[PDB]
DNA sequence: CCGTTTTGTGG
């Protein structure tokens, strides 16, 4: 997730 | 040590 908590996706 | 959709990053 995020960064932070990728994305998603990516 | 964290965190869902795609196979990853600054927090």
Request: hydrophobic share 25%; charged share 0%; net charge neutral.
């Amino acid at each position: 997730t995020x960064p932070g908590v990728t994305x998603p996706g990516v």
